[PDB]
Amino acid sequence: MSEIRKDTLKAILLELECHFTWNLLKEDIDLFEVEDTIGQQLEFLTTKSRLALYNLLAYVKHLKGQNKDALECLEQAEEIIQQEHSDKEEVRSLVTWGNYAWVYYHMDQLEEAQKYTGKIGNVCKKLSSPSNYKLECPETDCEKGWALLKFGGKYYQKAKAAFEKALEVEPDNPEFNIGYAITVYRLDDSDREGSVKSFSLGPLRKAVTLNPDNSYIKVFLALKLQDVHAEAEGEKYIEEILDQISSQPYVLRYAAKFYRRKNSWNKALELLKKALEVTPTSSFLHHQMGLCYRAQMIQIKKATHNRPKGKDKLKVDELISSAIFHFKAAMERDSMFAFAYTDLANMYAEGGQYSNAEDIFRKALRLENITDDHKHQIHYHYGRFQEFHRKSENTAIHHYLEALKVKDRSPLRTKLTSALKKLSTKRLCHNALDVQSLSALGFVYKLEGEKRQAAEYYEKAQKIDPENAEFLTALCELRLSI
RNA sequence: CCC
Ligand SMILES: [Mg+2]
């Protein structure tokens, strides 16, 4: 192909609606985890669109440099279109064809790619689309919403908008409602400024009504009810679900979360183990197992006033070892699972395995592509490890400051500001010229809206370090604020 | 998927 036809083709490729134009970046996920879990949903979450799953898996295989394997996934998608979408064959094929075009493009099979853009263009014309090479429709909006969700927390607002676009056309579509309600449910937990939210409660009730046979959507309703102090109602739903299904890991794992949150740890462990028989490598399941063992360990520690002896001490050590095992497995199976790192590191710290804790915290601090909320929490946990285990007040202060710089409204805000005030005040009693502590107080007072007091701290810090760029900038901000 |  002449490289002028090439430029034209590249332009068309960008106009398509498919995974390659949805800004799904590989660095935001663990590709092995995503590939593996897509396979596990194909087998074990049988209510989710198989067509969507294969289109997504094809994209993921491409991201792993396996273009030949991506093609095979798209072939399976085509088979499903014959199987499950025969009446609307052409329109249901658009996303698959888009991915074919992009994959063949990447394999330098330009003529083959053009064949696919041609098919797309023909169908869009046939169906009176206002665009040349796309036909926006609710089913595609839904598929896009799920693809966005799979790429993680940075994409949740975009996924919500995609499901909203689908619901604009079909407000009572059962599939669209599930996607939307689950997105709002995750957003209730995402980027919290304070208490957990419950905007998803209404959407979940509707999605459950619209999908009576679906235990997967119902388990989120139960969890949300638990969040809003209707634990009794939530638990009845859990019981009904467990009467209706067995061994479905995507349902059992959330029932296990439910039971754990009311401290029924043995029941949670029973459910998690049943799920592990089906999917023994799931990082989600492993994390949940560790959470159970950790909770049981904490109960013994509290009961024995943090001084367990004899068999209590033996059990505590077994539980710590088991929590480490499972948190380590979770992290190893999902490199982007922020909480797996901090939970593992914190458990290493609890067991006094400080070199191990440091190793994990170091990796966690270097995760560049997780959400700012997760970065914030990593700094908080490392700060606490520094303060209480390493007894390094200056390193603690440093990381508490980093936590607030990344996110200054969170449920950790007041824990962070109070720790900083406490540590900085103590250090200033010993050395009135301690620049880090002066600077820290300036930062916290500025955050609290105490402009004058903040200025005074920064001015003392600047007196000591007159050319400091950070202090000059802080003082300028304080002067120009209205 | 922590809290
Ligand atoms: Mg996952």
The CATH architecture assigned to A134-198 reads Alpha Horseshoe (1.25)
The candidate with the shortest Cα–Cα distance to A223, out of A192, A245, A246, A256, is: A256
Which tokens is A445 given?
């007072």
For residue A256, give the nucleotide whose C1' atom is nearest its CA: B1
The percent of chain A in helix, strand and coil, each rounded to the nearest 5, is 75, 0, 25
- Break chain A into its structural domains and give their ranges: 1-133, 134-198, 199-482
Q: Which residue ranges have CB below 7 A from strand B?
A: A 152, 185-186, 189, 196, 257, 261, 283-284, 287-288, 291, 295, 334, 336-339, 342-343, 377, 411
Q: Which residue, counting CA atoms, is nearest to the C1' of nucleotide B3?
A: A411
The candidate with the shortest Cα–Cα distance to A363, out of A341, A340, A346, is: A341
Distance of C1' in B2 from CA in A434, Å: 35
- Whether the Cβ atoms of residue A97 and residue A75 lie closer than 8 Å to each other: no
How many helices and strands, by DSSP H and E, does chain A display?
A: 24, 0
- What's the CATH code, domain A1-133? 1.25.40.10
For residue A186, give the nucleotide whose C1' atom is nearest its CA: B1
Q: Ligand 1 centre and the CA of A7: distance in Å?
A: 37
Which nucleotides in chain B have some atom under 7 angstroms from a protein Cβ? 1-3
Whole-angstrom distance, CA of residue A385 vs CA of residue A350: 10
Running DSSP on this structure, what letter comes out for residue A440?
H
Which tokens is A256 given?
């296990």
Residues 6 or more apart whose Cβ sits within 8 Å of residue A314: none
Residues 6 or more apart whose Cβ sits within 8 Å of residue A20: A13, A59, A98, A99, A102
Whole-angstrom distance, CA of residue A115 vs CA of residue A110: 9
Distance of C1' in B2 from CA in A152, Å: 16
Interruptions in chain A after residues (C–N over 2.5 Å): none
Q: Do domains A1-133 and A134-198 have the same CATH topology?
A: yes
Distance of C1' in B1 from CA in A429, Å: 43
Going from the C-alpha of A60 to that of each of A30, A65, A290, the distances in angstroms are 10, 9, 29
- Whether the Cβ atoms of residue A41 and residue A53 lie closer than 8 Å to each other: yes
Q: Ligand 1 centre and the CA of A115: distance in Å?
A: 35
- Whether the Cβ atoms of residue A10 and residue A133 lie closer than 8 Å to each other: no
- Whether the Cβ atoms of residue A70 and residue A375 lie closer than 8 Å to each other: no
Residues 6 or more apart whose Cβ sits within 8 Å of residue A33: A283, A333, A334, A335, A336, A337
Give the method of determination.
X-ray
- DSSP alpha helices (H): ranges in A45-192? 50-63, 67-84, 94-106, 110-126, 138-150, 156-169, 174-189
Whole-angstrom distance, CA of residue A340 vs CA of residue A332: 9
Terminal-residue alpha carbon distance, chain A: 61
- Whether the Cβ atoms of residue A254 and residue A277 lie closer than 8 Å to each other: no
Running DSSP on this structure, what letter comes out for residue A63?
H
Distance of C1' in B1 from CA in A122, Å: 43
Taking every pair of Cα atoms in chain A, the longest distance, rounded to a whole number of angstroms, is: 79
Q: Ligand 1 centre and the CA of A149: distance in Å?
A: 10
Distance of C1' in B3 from CA in A278, Å: 29
For residue A287, give the nucleotide whose C1' atom is nearest its CA: B1
Whole-angstrom distance, CA of residue A55 vs CA of residue A74: 6
Q: Ligand 1 centre and the CA of A319: distance in Å?
A: 25
The candidate with the shortest Cα–Cα distance to A53, out of A74, A69, A68, is: A74
Neighbours of A48 (CB within 10 A): 18
Output the CA torsion sign for A254, A259, A261, A265. negative
Neighbours of A406 (CB within 10 A): 18
Whole-angstrom distance, CA of residue A462 vs CA of residue A464: 5
Q: Tell which phi-psi region holds residue A450, choosing left (phi > 0), alpha (psi between -120 and 50) or beta.
A: beta
Whole-angstrom distance, CA of residue A189 vs CA of residue A116: 41
Q: Which residue, counting CA atoms, is nearest to the C1' of nucleotide B2?
A: A339
**DSSP strand E in A188-324: where?**
none
Neighbours of A297 (CB within 10 A): 21
